[PDB]
């Protein structure tokens, strides 16, 4: 949650502690890394028990909730136990915290793996910090009504997470910090409905592949932005007292499709970008008079420019 993962990665960077130059202290090279490594696993997963706060308790929780691969948990257990045994063995003789080099051979080669779980963990946290930003300006574009930018940003968000191999679940915890406006939900609500309409409307007897496909793809992206904030089936709370113009947002979706569609992309007999323009003009023309309604918009959303006389009147 708001359990600063910036600190979880502080505890992880501190554990990453590093190998010896040949000469190895059991405190500074092994037990200390692990104790920070456990506090890192504590702050990353918000590890809470109404009963932590113990090293075995923390290990017990990780197993209970499959928060980490078993092979990786057991490895932390086997090493912390061996460290425990060694500190005791050494405090019972003659340096009390330092041992010979060749004895620690097997232990350190298992600590190196835990350092690998260190970096792998830290990296994804850093990639999550970035995904926090990208989502945060998408919601910020949404906040100021600019639909052009919202769809551009939500796409940049999506592209990053695929690249850095992240999921909706991964981002949701550290988004407890921000909130989507109730009026911002009404925009998303509008965006959702217009796209849902458009996609089905554009499935016609001329063509039912490219155009609905594209429209759905826009709608999934807006849905993906939503999924990043909300849990499965968690309802959205819109402000019905504030509603965006359906014609305005339809043009928005249209602009966005122009920018992301291939130059080689074609809807039926026409180029996709070209048809978007034609459909943009037609609505802007409806907007310019006072003819924008559900019946009259549907006519545009469903057209494939099969009337070439009409389609070609816009060019000349």
């Amino acid at each position: 949650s708001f359990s600063n993962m910036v600190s979880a990665k502080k505890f992880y960077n501190k554990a990453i502690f590093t190998a010896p130059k040949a000469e190895v202290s059991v405190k500074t090279h092994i037990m200390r890394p692990i104790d920070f490594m456990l506090m890192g696993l504590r702050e990353e997963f918000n590890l809470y028990s109404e009963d932590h706060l113990s090293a075995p308790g923390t290990i017990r929780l990780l197993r209970e909730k499959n928060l980490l691969p078993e092979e990786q948990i057991a490895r932390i257990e086997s090493v912390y136990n061996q460290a425990m045994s060694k500190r005791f063995e050494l405090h019972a003789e003659h340096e009390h915290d330092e041992m010979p080099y060749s004895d620690a051979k097997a232990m350190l080669d298992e600590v190196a793996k835990i350092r690998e779980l260190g970096v792998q963990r830290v990296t994804r946290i850093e990639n999550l910090e970035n995904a926090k930003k990208l989502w945060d300006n998408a919601n910020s574009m949404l906040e100021k009504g600019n639909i052009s930018g919202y769809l551009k940003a939500a796409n940049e968000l999506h592209k990053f997470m695929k690249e850095k191999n992240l999921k909706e679940d991964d981002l949701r915890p550290e988004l407890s910090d921000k909130t989507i406006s109730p009026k911002g939900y009404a925009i998303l609500q509008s965006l959702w409905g217009a796209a849902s309409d458009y996609s089905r409307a554009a499935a016609t007897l001329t063509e039912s592949t490219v155009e609905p496909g594209l429209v759905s793809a826009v709608n999934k992206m807006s849905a993906f932005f939503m999924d990043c904030k909300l849990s499965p089936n968690e309802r959205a709370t819109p402000d019905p007292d504030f509603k965006v113009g359906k014609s305005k947002i339809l043009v928005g979706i249209m602009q966005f499709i122009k920018d992301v569609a291939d130059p080689t992309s074609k809807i039926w007999m026409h180029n996709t970008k070209a048809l978007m323009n034609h459909k943009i003009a037609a609505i802007q023309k409806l907007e310019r008079s006072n003819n924008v309604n559900d019946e009259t918009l549907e006519s545009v959303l469903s057209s494939k420019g099969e009337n070439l006389s009409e389609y070609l009147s816009y060019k000349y």
Binding site: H158, K159, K162, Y185, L188, Q189, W192, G193, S196, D197, S199, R200, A201, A203, T204, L205, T206, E207, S208, T209, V210, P212, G213, L214, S216, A217, N219, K220, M221, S222, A223, F224, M226, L230, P232, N233, E234, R235, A236, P238, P240, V260, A261, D262, T264, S265, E306
Partner: protein, 162 residues
């Protein structure tokens, strides 16, 4: 009536996530078409072609993307047929009970069919058929080829209506 199909029946698949929708549209093929942007996110519909009365008919099923967030019913009006899915789940039927009624009140010529359990690992009975028959909607417990054949039968009721 103007590429490789004559008629075209648009179908809504209204239902929440974790309800077991996906296992109905498994014998519904994904749209073969692809370009840069569609590739990154996919789509929220599936296509299917069947010979009927010697004519090619195209089914198009919409698992409307992000229905979850919005359960305010205005008219979201085009579809030739609406399908509502809910079985190894308590609240699944309870929520559907409000949707299926607010759909029936604001629709008609449109086909309706209430539905299943996937990942076979059941708190809802074969009557609790009773709620469906109250409004006049065919109910089915499914999953199989049995579910695909349940669609190719529904894709014949719309044909008789034209």
């Amino acid at each position: 009536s103007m590429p490789e199909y004559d008629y075209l029946f648009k179908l809504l698949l209204i239902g929440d996530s974790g309800v077991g929708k996906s296992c109905l549209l498994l014998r519904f093929a994904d749209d073969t078409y692809t370009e840069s942007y569609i590739s990154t996110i996919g789509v929220d519909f599936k296509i299917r072609t069947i010979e009927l009365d010697g004519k090619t008919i195209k089914l198009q099923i919409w698992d409307t993307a992000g229905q979850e967030r919005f359960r305010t019913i205005t008219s979201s009006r085009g579809a030739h047929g609406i399908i509502v899915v809910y079985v190894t789940d308590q609240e699944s039927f309870n929520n559907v009970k409000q949707w299926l009624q607010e759909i029936d009140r604001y629709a008609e010529n449109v086909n309706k069919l209430l539905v299943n359990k996937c990942d076979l690992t059941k708190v809802v009975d074969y009557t609790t058929k009773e709620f469906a028959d109250s409004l006049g909607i065919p109910f089915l417990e499914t999953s199989a080829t049995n579910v695909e054949q349940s669609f190719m039968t529904m894709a014949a009721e719309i044909k008789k209506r034209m």
